[PDB]
A paper describes a structure:
GIPC1 (GAIP interacting protein, C-terminus 1) and its two paralogs GIPC2 and GIPC3 are universal adaptor proteins that bind and regulate vesicular trafficking of many transmembrane proteins. GIPCs contribute to the endocytosis process by tethering the cargo proteins on endocytic vesicles to the motor protein myosin VI. GIPCs contain a central PDZ (PSD-95, Dlg and ZO-1) domain that mediates the interaction with the C-terminal PDZ-binding motif (PBM) in cargo proteins. The transmembrane receptor PlexinD1 contains a C-terminal ‘SEA’ motif that constitutes a PBM and interacts with GIPC1.
We determined the crystal structures of the myosin VI-HCBD in complex with the GH2 domain from GIPC1 and GIPC2, respectively. The GIPC2-GH2/myosin VI structure forms the same alternating array, despite being crystallized in a different condition and space group. The recurrence of this repeating array argues strongly that this arrangement captures the oligomeric interaction mode between GIPCs and myosin VI that is relevant to function, rather than being a crystal packing artifact. The bivalent interactions between the GIPC-GH2 and myosin VI-HCBD are mediated by two distinct interfaces. Interface I involves the two loops in the GIPC-GH2 domain, one between helices α1 and α2 and the other between helices α3 and α4. These two loops interact with Arg1084 and Arg1085 in the ‘RRL’ motif on one side of the second helix in the myosin VI-HCBD. The two interfaces in the GIPC2-GH2/HCBD complex structure are highly similar to those in the GIPC1-GH2/HCBD complex. The alternative arrays mediated by the bivalent interactions seen here suggest an unanticipated mechanism for high-order oligomerization of the GIPC/myosin VI complex. The linear array of the GIPC/myosin VI complex formed through their mutual bivalent binding provides an elegant mechanism for myosin VI oligomerization.
Author numbering:
A (entry chain B): 1053 to 1096
B (entry chain A): 238 to 312
Write the structure that this text describes.
Amino acid sequence: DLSKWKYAELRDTINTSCDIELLAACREEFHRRLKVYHAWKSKN
Amino acid sequence: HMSEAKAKAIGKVDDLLELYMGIRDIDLATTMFEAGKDKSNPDEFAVALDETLGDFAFPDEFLFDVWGAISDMKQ
């Protein structure tokens, strides 16, 4: 249920929350997005 | 001017790209846009995306708004 998160919501959370699991789950989700981007951007 | 329409469409799409990833490049926005100007429903569009951009796992509210941006070229 993290895919449906808006960017600025991932961003405000990583930059303000305290939840150890949530913080780590937002990083790896924010990462996953710019990950697949970097992948597609490489070919194109 | 039917080219100002394409440009507005793409521009409205990478606008949605900045809301989803904070990123913004026209090559991606155009890649997506040119996967919809042939289809008729957001499911036909969803299939075209999955070929090139399958690994993105785009949220449904996002690929709607993009399809919403493409269908606006009808008027």
